[PDB]
Amino acid sequence: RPTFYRQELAKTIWEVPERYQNLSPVGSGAYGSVCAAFDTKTGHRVAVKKLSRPFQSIIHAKRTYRELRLLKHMKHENVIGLLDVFTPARSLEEFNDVYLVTHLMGADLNNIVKCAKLTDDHVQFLIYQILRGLKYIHSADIIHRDLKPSNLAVNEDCELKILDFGVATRWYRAPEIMLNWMHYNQTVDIWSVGCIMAELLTGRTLFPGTDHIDQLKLILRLVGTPGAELLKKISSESARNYIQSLAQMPKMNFANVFIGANPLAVDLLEKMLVLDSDKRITAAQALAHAYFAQYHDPDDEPVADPYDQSFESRDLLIDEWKSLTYDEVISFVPPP
Numbered sequence: 001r002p003t004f005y006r007q008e009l010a011k012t013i014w015e016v017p018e019r020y021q022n023l024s025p026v027g028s029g030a031y032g033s034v035c036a037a038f039d040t041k042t043g044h045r046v047a048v049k050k051l052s053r054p055f056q057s058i059i060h061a062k063r064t065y066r067e068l069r070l071l072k073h074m075k076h077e078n079v080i081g082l083l084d085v086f087t088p089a090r091s092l093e094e095f096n097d098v099y100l101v102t103h104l105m106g107a108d109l110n111n112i113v114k115c116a117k118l119t120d121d122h123v124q125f126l127i128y129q130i131l132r133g134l135k136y137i138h139s140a141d142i143i144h145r146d147l148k149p150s151n152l153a154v155n156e157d158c159e160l161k162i163l164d165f166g167v168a169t170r171w172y173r174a175p176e177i178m179l180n181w182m183h184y185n186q187t188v189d190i191w192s193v194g195c196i197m198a199e200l201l202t203g204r205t206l207f208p209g210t211d212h213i214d215q216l217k218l219i220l221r222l223v224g225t226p227g228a229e230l231l232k233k234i235s236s237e238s239a240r241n242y243i244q245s246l247a248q249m250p251k252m253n254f255a256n257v258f259i260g261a262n263p264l265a266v267d268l269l270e271k272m273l274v275l276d277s278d279k280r281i282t283a284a285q286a287l288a289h290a291y292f293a294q295y296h297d298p299d300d301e302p303v304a305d306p307y308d309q310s311f312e313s314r315d316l317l318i319d320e321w322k323s324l325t326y327d328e329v330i331s332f333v334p335p336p
């Protein structure tokens, strides 16, 4: 067991292995209880996250376990990975805190775009990586659900990583989620990618809504009123009428919005920003799209190992979730 040392950052007490030095708060709370630190074992800067109140409730307990399990499984170039996980507790009895360690990301997508308009090559590479990482997460039967510029990190060589901190999320949210259609599929993430890719090509938020309703009306105005085909798949009658009553604004054509952009990029955009999620292109298919020809490689776009998510359909007591979490902490083996 490493030797720990404690300190108070802001108003919280951090107790971490000596290995991690010079802890410094970051994200102004945007990442949560996160600190940047120097991993003395490798000389590399890392992000140390102290889970809030891990076991204060059953909901917290399960989310704690969920994140620990997910991070331990995520082994992909375009997805955040778990470098270390620890607790100052010496036993299950005193186990009350969990810290997750990951590489420290450099800058999000906003910081990179806030400069000058990225070239088409730049856009291809970035979107390609998001799509590459998405293929991997989706292959593990996992849905991000909150993709956005602030959740996407890019390094020196423009390498990108998908993260989550648990730009308004709504601007990139698929319409079916904001309509509470309950039956969301993975492509809800593809809608977000389209909104992100659009913003990188125009420098402006595609659907900058004030509230969800306004946001919804903006979306329908661009992707159009729901067609007969989509309407017949909506069981709720009030839902069916509502979605139509929200598409009363004067229509807008797609092409106009992306004028000047590479025709291939607009083609992909039209296949990502489709109202009917069933007809929305998947991450896997997007990767083969001609817009990513200079980057696509069927041999270097890996999927995830089978991921056991049986715990999601479980309803257990806090202590049970805590014990399960503790087990995952002790069984953690760092990657080479």
Ligand SMILES: COc1c(NC(=O)c2ccc(C)c(-n3cc(C(=O)NCc4ccccc4)nn3)c2)cc(C(C)(C)C)cc1NS(C)(=O)=O
Pocket (backbone or CB within 6 Å): 026, 027, 031, 034, 047, 048, 049, 063, 066, 067, 068, 070, 071, 074, 079, 080, 100, 101, 102, 103, 104, 105, 106, 107, 108, 137, 142, 143, 144, 150, 151, 152, 153, 162, 163, 164, 165, 166
């Ligand atoms: C919230 O839980 C997660 C996570 N956890 C994380 O992404 C995570 C874990 C630990 C740490 C220390 C961090 N982390 C790294 C940084 C960082 O480098 N910030 C600086 C910086 C940052 C950006 C730009 C510039 C500078 N901050 N926090 C992230 C991931 C995921 C996916 C992406 C795999 C689907 C889902 C959930 N959802 S769930 C399990 O259902 O709960």
